[PDB]
PDB file of C-alpha atoms in Angstrom:
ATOM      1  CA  UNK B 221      40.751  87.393  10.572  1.00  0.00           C
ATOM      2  CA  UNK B 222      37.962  89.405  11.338  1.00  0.00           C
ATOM      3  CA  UNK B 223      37.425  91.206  14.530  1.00  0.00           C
ATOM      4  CA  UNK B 224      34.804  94.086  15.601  1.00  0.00           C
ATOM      5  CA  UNK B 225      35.243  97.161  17.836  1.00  0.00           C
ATOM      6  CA  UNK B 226      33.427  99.921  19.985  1.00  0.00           C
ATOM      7  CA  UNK B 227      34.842 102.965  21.388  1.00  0.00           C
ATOM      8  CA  UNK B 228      34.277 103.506  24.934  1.00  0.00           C
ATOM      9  CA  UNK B 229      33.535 106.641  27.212  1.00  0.00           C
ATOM     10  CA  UNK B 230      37.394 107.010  28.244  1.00  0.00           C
ATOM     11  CA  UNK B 231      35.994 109.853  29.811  1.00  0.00           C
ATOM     12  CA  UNK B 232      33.790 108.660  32.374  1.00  0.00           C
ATOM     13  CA  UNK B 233      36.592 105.352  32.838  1.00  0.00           C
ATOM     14  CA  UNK B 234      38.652 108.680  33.932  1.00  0.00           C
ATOM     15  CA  UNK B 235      35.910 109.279  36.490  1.00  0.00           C
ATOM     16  CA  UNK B 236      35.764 105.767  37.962  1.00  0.00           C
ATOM     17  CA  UNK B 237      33.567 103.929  35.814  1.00  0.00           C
ATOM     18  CA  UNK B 238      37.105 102.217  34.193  1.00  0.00           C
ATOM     19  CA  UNK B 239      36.391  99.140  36.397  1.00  0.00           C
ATOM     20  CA  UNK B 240      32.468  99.603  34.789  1.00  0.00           C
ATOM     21  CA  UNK B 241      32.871  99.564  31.199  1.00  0.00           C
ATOM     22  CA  UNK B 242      32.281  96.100  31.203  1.00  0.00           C
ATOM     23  CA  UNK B 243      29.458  94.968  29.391  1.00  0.00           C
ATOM     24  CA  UNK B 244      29.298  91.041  29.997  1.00  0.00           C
ATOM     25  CA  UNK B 245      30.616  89.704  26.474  1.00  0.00           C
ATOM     26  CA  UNK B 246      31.918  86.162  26.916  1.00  0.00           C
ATOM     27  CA  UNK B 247      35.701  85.913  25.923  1.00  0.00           C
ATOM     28  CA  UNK B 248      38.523  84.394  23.847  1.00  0.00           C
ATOM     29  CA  UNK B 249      41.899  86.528  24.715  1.00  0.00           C
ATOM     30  CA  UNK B 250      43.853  88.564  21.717  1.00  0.00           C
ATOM     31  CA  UNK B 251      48.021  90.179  21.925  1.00  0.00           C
ATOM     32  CA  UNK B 252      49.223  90.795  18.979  1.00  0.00           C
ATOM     33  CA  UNK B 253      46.691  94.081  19.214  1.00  0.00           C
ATOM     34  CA  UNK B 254      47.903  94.678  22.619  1.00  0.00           C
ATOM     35  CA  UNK B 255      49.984  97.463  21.161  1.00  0.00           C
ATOM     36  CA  UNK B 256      46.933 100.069  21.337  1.00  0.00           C
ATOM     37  CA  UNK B 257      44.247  96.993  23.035  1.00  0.00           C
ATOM     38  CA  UNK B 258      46.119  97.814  26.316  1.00  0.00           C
ATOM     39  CA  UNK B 259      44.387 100.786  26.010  1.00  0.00           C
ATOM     40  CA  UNK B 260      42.152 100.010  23.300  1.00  0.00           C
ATOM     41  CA  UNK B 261      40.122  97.035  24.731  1.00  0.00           C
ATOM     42  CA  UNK B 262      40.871  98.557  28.301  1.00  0.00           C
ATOM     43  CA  UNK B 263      40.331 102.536  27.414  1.00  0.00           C
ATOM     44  CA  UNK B 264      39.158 103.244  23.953  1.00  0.00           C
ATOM     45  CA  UNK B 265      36.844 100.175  22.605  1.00  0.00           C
ATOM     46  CA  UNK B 266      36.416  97.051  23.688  1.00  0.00           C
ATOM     47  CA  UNK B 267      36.203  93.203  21.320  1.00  0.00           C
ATOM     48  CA  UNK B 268      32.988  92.128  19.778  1.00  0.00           C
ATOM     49  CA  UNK B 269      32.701  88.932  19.131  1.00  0.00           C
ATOM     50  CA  UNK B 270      31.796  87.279  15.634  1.00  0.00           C
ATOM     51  CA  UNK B 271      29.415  84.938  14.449  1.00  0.00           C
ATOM     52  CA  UNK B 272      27.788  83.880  10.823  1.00  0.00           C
ATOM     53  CA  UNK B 273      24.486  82.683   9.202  1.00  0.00           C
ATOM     54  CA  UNK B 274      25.001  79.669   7.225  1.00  0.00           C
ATOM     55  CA  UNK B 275      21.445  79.121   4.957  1.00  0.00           C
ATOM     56  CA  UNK B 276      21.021  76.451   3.902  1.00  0.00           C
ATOM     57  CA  UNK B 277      20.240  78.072   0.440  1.00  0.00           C
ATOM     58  CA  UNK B 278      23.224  79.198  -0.185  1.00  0.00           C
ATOM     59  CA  UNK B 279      25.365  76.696   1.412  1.00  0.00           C
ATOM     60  CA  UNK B 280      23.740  74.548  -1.538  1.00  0.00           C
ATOM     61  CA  UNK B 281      24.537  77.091  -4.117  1.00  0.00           C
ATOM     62  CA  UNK B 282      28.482  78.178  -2.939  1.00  0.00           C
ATOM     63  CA  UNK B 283      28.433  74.243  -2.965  1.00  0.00           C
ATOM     64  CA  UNK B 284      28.766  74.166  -6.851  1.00  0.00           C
ATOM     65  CA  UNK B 285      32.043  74.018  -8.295  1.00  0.00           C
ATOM     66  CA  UNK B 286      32.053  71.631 -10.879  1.00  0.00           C
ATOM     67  CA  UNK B 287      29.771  70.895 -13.988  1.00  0.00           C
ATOM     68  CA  UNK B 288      30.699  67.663 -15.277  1.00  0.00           C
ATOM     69  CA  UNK B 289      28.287  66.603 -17.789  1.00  0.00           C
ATOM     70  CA  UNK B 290      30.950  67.098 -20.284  1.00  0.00           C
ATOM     71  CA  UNK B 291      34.199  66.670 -17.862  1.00  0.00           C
ATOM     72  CA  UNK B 292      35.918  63.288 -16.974  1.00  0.00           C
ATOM     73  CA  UNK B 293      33.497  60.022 -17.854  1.00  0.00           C
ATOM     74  CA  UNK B 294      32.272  61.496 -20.736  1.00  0.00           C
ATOM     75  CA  UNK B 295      36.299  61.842 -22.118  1.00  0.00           C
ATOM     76  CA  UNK B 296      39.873  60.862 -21.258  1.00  0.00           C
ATOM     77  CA  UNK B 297      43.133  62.365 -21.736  1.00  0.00           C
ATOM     78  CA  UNK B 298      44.763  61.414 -25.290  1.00  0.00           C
ATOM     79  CA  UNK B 299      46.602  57.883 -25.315  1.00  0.00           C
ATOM     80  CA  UNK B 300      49.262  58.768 -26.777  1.00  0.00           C
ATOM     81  CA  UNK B 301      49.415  61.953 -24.116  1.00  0.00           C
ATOM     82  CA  UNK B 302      48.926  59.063 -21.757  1.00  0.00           C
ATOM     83  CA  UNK B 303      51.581  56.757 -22.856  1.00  0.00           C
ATOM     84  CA  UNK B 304      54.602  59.651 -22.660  1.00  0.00           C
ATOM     85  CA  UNK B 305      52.999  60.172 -19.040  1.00  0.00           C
ATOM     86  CA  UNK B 306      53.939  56.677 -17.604  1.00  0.00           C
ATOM     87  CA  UNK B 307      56.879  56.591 -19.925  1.00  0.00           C
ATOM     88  CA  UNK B 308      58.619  59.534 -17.695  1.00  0.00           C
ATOM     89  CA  UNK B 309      57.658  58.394 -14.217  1.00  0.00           C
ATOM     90  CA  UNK B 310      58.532  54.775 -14.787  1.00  0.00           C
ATOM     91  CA  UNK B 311      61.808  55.705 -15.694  1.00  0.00           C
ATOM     92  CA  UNK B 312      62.540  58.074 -12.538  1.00  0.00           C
ATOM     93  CA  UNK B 313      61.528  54.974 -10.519  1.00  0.00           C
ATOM     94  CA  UNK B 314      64.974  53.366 -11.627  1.00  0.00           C
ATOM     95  CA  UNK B 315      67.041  56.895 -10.889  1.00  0.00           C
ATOM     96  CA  UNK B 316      65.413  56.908  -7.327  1.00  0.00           C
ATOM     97  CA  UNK B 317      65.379  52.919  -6.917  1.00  0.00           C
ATOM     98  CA  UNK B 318      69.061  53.130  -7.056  1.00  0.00           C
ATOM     99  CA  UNK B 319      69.987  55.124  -4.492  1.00  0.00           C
ATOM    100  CA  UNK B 320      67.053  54.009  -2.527  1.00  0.00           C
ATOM    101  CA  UNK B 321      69.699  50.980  -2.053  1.00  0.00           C
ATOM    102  CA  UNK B 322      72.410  52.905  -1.224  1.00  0.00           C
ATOM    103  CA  UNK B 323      70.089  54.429   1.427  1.00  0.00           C
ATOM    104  CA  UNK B 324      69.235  51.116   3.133  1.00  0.00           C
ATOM    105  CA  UNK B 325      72.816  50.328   3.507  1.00  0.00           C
ATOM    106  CA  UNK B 326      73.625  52.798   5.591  1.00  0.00           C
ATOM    107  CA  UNK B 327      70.559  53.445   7.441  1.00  0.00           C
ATOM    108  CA  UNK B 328      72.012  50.600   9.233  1.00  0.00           C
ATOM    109  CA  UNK B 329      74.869  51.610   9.650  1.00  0.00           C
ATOM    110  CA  UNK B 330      73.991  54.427  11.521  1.00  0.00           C
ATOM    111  CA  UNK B 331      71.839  56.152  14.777  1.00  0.00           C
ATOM    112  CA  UNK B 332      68.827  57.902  13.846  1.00  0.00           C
ATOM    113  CA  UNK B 333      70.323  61.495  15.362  1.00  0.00           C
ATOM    114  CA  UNK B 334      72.651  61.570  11.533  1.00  0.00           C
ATOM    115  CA  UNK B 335      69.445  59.963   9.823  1.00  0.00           C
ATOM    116  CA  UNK B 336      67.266  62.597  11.637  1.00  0.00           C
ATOM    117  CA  UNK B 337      69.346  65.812  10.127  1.00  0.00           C
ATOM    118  CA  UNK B 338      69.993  63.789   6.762  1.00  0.00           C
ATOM    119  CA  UNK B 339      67.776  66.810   4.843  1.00  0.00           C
ATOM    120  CA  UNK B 340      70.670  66.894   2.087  1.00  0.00           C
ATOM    121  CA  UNK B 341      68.869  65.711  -1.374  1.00  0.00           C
ATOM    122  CA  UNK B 342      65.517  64.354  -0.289  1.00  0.00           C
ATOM    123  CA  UNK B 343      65.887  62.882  -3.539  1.00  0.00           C
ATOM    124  CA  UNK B 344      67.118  59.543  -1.924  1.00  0.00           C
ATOM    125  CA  UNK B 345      64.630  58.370   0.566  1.00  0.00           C
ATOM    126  CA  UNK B 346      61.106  56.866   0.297  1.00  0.00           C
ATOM    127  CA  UNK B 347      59.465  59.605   0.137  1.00  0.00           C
ATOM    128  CA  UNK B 348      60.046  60.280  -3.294  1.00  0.00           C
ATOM    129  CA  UNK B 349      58.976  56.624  -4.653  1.00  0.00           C
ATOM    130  CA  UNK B 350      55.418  57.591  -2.499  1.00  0.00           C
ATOM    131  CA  UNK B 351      55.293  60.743  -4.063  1.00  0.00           C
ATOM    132  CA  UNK B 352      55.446  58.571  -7.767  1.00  0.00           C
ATOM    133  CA  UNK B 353      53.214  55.726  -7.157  1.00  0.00           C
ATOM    134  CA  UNK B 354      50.508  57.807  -5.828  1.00  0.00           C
ATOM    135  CA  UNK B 355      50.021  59.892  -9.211  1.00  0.00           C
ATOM    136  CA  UNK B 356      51.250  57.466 -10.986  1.00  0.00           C
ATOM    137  CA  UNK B 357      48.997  54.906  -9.540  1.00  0.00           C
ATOM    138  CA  UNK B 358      45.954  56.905  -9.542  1.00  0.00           C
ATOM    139  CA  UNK B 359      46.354  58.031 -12.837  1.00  0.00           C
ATOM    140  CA  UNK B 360      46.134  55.051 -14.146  1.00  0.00           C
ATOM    141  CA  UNK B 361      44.019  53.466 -12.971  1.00  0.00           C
ATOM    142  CA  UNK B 362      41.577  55.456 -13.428  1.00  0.00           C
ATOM    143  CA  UNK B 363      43.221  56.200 -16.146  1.00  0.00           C
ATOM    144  CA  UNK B 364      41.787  52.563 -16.683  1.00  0.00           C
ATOM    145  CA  UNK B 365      38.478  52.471 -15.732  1.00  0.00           C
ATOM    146  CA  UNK B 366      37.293  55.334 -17.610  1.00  0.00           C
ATOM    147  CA  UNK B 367      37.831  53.534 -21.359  1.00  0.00           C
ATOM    148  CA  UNK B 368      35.539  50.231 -19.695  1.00  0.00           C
ATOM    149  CA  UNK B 369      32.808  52.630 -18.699  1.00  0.00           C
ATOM    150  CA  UNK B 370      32.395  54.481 -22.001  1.00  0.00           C
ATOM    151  CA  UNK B 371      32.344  51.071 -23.665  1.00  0.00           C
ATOM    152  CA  UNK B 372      29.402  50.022 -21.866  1.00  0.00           C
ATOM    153  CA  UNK B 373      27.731  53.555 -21.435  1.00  0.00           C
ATOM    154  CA  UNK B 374      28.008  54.827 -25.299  1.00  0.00           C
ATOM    155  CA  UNK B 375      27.867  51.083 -26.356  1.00  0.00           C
TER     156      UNK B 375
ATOM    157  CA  UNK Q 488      42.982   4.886 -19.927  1.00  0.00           C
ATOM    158  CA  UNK Q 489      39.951   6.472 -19.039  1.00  0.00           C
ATOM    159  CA  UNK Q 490      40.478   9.381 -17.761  1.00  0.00           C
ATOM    160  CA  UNK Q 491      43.229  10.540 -20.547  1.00  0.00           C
ATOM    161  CA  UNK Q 492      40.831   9.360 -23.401  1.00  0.00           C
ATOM    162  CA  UNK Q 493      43.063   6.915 -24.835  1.00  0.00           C
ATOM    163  CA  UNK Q 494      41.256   3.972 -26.999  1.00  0.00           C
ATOM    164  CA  UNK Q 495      41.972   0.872 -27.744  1.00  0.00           C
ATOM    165  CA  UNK Q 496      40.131   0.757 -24.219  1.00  0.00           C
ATOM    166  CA  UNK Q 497      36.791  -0.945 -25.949  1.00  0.00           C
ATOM    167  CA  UNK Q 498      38.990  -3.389 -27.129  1.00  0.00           C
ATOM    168  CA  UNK Q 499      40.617  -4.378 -23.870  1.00  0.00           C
ATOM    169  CA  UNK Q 500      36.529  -4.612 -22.158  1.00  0.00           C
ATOM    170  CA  UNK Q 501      36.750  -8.139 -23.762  1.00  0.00           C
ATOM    171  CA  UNK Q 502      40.503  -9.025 -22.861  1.00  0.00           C
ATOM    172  CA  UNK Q 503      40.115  -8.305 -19.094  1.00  0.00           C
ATOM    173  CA  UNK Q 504      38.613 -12.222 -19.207  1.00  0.00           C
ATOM    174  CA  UNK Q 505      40.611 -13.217 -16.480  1.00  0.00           C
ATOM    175  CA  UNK Q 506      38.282 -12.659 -14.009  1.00  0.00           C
ATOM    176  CA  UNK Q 507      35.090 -13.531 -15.918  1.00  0.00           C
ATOM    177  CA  UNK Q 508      32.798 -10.794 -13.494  1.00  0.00           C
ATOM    178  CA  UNK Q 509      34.761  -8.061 -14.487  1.00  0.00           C
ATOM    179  CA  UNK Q 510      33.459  -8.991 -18.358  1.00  0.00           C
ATOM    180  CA  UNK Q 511      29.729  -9.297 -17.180  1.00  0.00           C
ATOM    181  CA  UNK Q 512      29.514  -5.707 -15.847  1.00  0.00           C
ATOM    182  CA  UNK Q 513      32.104  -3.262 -17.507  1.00  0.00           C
ATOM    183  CA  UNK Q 514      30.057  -3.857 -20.589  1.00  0.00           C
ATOM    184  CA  UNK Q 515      28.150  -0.689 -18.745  1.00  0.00           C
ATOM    185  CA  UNK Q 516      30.985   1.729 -19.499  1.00  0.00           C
ATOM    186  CA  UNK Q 517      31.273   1.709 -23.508  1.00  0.00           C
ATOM    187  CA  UNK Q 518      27.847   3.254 -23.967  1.00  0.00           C
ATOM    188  CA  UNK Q 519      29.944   6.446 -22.432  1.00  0.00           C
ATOM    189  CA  UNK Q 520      32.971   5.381 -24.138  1.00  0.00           C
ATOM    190  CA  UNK Q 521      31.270   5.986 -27.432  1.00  0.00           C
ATOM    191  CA  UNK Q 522      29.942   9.486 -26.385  1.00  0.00           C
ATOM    192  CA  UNK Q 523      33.180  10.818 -25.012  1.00  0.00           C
ATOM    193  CA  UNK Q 524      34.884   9.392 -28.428  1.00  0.00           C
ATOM    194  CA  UNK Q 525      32.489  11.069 -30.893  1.00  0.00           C
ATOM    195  CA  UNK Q 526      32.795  14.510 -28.879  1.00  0.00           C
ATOM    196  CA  UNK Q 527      36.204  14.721 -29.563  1.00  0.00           C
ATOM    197  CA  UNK Q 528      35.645  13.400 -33.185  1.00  0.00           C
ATOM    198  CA  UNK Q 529      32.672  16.265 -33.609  1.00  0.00           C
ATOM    199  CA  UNK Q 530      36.086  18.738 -33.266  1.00  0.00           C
ATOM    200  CA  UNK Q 531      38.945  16.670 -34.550  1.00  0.00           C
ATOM    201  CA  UNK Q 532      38.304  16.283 -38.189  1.00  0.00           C
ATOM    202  CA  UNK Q 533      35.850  17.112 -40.710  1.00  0.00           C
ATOM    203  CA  UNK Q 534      35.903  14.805 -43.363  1.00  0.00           C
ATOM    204  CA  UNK Q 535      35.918  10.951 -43.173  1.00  0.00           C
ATOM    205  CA  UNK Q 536      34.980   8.085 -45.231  1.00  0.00           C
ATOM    206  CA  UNK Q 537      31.325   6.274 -43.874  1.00  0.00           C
ATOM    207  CA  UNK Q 538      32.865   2.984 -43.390  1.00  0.00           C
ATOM    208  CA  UNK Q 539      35.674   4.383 -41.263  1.00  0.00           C
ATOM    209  CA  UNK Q 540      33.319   6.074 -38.980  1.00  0.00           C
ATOM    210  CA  UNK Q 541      31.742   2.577 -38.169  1.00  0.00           C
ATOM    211  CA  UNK Q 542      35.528   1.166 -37.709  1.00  0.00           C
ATOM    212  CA  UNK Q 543      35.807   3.759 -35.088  1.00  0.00           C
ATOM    213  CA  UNK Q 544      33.259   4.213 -32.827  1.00  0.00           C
ATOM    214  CA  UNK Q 545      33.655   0.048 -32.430  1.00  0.00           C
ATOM    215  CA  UNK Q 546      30.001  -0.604 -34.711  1.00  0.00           C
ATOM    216  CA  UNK Q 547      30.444  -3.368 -37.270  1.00  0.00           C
ATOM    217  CA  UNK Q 548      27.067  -2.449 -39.507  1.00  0.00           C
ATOM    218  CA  UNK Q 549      26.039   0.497 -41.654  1.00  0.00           C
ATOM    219  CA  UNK Q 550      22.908   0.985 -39.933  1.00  0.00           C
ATOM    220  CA  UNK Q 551      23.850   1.660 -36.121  1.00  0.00           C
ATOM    221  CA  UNK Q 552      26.126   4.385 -37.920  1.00  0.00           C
ATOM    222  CA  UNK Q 553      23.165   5.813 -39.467  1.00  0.00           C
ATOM    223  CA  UNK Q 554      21.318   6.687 -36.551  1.00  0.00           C
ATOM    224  CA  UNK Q 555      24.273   7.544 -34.639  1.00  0.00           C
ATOM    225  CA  UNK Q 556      25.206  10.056 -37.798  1.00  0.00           C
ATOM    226  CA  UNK Q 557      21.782  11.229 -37.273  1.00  0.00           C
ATOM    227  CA  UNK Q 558      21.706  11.974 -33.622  1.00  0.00           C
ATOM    228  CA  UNK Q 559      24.805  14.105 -33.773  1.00  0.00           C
ATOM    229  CA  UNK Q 560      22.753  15.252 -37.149  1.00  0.00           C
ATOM    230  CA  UNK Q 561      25.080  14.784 -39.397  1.00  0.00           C
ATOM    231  CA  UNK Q 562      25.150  14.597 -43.711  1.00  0.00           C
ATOM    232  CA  UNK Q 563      25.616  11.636 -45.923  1.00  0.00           C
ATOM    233  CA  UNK Q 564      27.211  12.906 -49.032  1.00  0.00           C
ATOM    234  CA  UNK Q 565      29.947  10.254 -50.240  1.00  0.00           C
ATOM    235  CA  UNK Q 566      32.333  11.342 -47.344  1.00  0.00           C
ATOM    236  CA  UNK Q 567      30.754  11.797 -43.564  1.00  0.00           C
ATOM    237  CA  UNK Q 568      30.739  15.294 -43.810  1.00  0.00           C
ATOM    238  CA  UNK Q 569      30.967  17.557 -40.189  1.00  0.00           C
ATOM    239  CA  UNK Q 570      29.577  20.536 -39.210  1.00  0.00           C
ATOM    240  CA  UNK Q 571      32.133  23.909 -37.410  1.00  0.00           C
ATOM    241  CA  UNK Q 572      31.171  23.571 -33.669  1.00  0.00           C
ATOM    242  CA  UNK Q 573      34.610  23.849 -32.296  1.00  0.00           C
ATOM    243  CA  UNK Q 574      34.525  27.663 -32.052  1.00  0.00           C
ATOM    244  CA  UNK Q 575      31.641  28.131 -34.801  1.00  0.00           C
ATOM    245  CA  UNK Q 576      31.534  32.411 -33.549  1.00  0.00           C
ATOM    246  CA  UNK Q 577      34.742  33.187 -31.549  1.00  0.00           C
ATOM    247  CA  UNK Q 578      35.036  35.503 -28.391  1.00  0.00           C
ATOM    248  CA  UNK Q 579      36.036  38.591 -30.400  1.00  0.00           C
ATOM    249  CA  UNK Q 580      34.046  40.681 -28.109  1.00  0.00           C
ATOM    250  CA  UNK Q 581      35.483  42.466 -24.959  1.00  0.00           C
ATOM    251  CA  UNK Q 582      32.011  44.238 -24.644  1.00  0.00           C
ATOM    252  CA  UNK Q 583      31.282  40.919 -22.350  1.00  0.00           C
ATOM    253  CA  UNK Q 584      33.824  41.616 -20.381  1.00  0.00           C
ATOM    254  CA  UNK Q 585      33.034  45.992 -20.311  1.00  0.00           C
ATOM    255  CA  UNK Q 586      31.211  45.106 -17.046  1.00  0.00           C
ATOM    256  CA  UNK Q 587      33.615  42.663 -15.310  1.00  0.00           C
ATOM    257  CA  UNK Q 588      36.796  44.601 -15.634  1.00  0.00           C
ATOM    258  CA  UNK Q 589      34.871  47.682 -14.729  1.00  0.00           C
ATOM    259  CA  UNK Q 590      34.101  45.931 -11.173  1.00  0.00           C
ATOM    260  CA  UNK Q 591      37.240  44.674 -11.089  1.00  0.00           C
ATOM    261  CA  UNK Q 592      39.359  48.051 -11.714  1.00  0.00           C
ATOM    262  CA  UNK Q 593      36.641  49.751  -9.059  1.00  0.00           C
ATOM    263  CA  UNK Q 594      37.944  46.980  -5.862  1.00  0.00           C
ATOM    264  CA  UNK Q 595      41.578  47.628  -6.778  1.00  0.00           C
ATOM    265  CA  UNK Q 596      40.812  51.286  -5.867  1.00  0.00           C
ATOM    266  CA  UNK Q 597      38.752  50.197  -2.283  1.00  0.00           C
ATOM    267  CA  UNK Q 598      41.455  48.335  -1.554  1.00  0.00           C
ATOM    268  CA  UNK Q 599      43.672  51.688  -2.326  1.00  0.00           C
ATOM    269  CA  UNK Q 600      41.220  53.971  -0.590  1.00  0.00           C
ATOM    270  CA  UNK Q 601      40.381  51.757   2.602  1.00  0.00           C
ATOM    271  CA  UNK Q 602      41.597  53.007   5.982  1.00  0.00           C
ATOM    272  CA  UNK Q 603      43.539  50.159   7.116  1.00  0.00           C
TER     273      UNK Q 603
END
C-alpha cells in the first residue's frame, strides 16, 4: 500500500472551479479513505497514481538469495538424523491410516451437507496422509540422490 | 537334452540309428556339444585327473586333449589344473552404478513434478 497526494485550491473549488480541479489522471477507484477522500480527493487533494523502475541491474542483484557452493550437493543432513526422521512419519501413517478407514465407511453412509461441515479433527481425512507423503517423499528422495552425486562428483 | 545341457547326448548321436539319415548329419552338432560342455567345465571344477578330461569331453587319445587343453590354455602339471574365471574380480563396486541410480532417482522426481 502506497498511495500519493496533492492538496488542492479548496478555495477557488469554493468559487466554481470545484467541477475544474480536474487534472486528467487516469483512474482506479479507492473507499476505505472515503472518510476525509470525500472531501479529500473531491476538496483538499486529489490521488496520484504509482508506478516503479525495475533495472535490470538490480533486478539481477535483489535476485541473490542463496550461495550454495557450500549448501546442499556439497553435504547432506546426518544419517542417523535422517533415519529418526522417517522413523516418526512412518509411524503417524499407521495412527492416521486407521481412522482414514473409519472415514471411508461413513463417507458413504452419508450426504455431503454433514461431510461438508465435518471440520471436527482434520486429523482423519486425506489431507493429512498428503500433508506426510509430500515431505516425507521429497525428503527422501532427494534425500537419495544427493549420496549418488557426491559419489561420482568427489569420486 | 539340448537345451538343459544334459549329456549322455553324444552318446545317443550314434543310437538314434533307426533312421540311418538322422546319423549322417547330426554328427554336425557335437563340435558345439563339446564347446558348451567345456564352458561349464572351465567353472565347475578345478582340479581333474588328464585321462578323465579325455573320458569327458567324448576324445579317446591323449593328444586331441592336448590341444584342446591348450586352446582353453590350460597347465599340465600331474592333475589338469584350471584357471579362476568364474568371477576372477567380483562387482564390489557401486561406483558403476553412481551414474545409473542417479538418472534413475532424477525420473522418479519428473514423474513427481509433471503437470498431469
Amino acid at each position: 500500500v502506497i498511495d500519493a497526494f496533492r492538496l488542492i485550491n479548496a478555495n477557488m473549488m469554493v468559487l466554481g472551479h470545484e467541477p475544474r480541479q480536474t487534472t486528467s489522471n487516469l483512474g482506479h477507484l479507492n473507499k476505505p479513505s472515503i472518510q476525509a477522500l470525500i472531501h479529500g480527493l473531491n476538496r483538499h487533494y486529489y490521488s496520484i497514481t504509482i508506478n516503479y523502475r525495475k533495472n535490470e541491474l538490480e533486478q539481477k542483484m535483489l535476485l541473490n538469495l542463496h550461495k550454495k557452493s557450500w549448501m546442499e550437493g556439497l553435504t547432506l543432513q546426518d544419517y542417523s538424523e535422517h533415519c529418526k526422521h522417517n522413523e516418526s512419519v512412518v509411524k503417524e501413517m499407521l495412527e492416521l491410516a486407521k481412522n482414514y478407514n473409519k472415514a471411508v465407511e461413513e463417507e458413504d453412509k452419508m450426504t455431503p451437507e454433514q461431510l461438508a461441515i465435518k471440520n471436527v479433527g482434520k486429523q482423519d481425512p486425506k489431507r493429512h496422509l498428503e500433508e506426510h507423503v509430500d515431505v516425507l517423499m521429497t525428503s527422501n528422495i532427494v534425500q537419495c540422490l544427493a549420496a549418488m552425486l557426491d559419489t561420482v562428483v568427489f569420486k | 537334452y539340448l537345451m538343459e545341457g544334459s549329456y549322455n547326448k553324444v552318446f545317443l548321436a550314434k543310437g538314434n540309428i533307426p533312421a540311418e539319415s538322422y546319423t549322417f548329419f547330426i554328427d554336425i552338432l557335437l563340435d558345439t556339444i563339446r564347446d558348451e560342455i567345456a564352458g561349464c567345465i572351465e567353472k565347475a571344477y578345478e582340479k581333474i585327473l588328464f585321462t578323465e578330461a579325455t573320458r569327458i569331453l567324448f576324445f579317446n587319445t591323449p593328444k586331441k586333449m592336448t590341444d584342446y587343453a591348450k586352446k582353453r590354455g590350460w597347465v599340465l602339471g600331474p592333475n589338469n589344473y584350471y584357471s579362476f574365471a568364474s568371477q576372477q574380480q567380483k562387482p564390489e563396486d557401486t561406483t558403476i552404478p553412481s551414474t545409473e541410480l542417479a538418472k534413475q532417482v532424477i525420473e522418479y522426481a519428473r514423474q513427481l513434478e509433471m503437470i498431469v
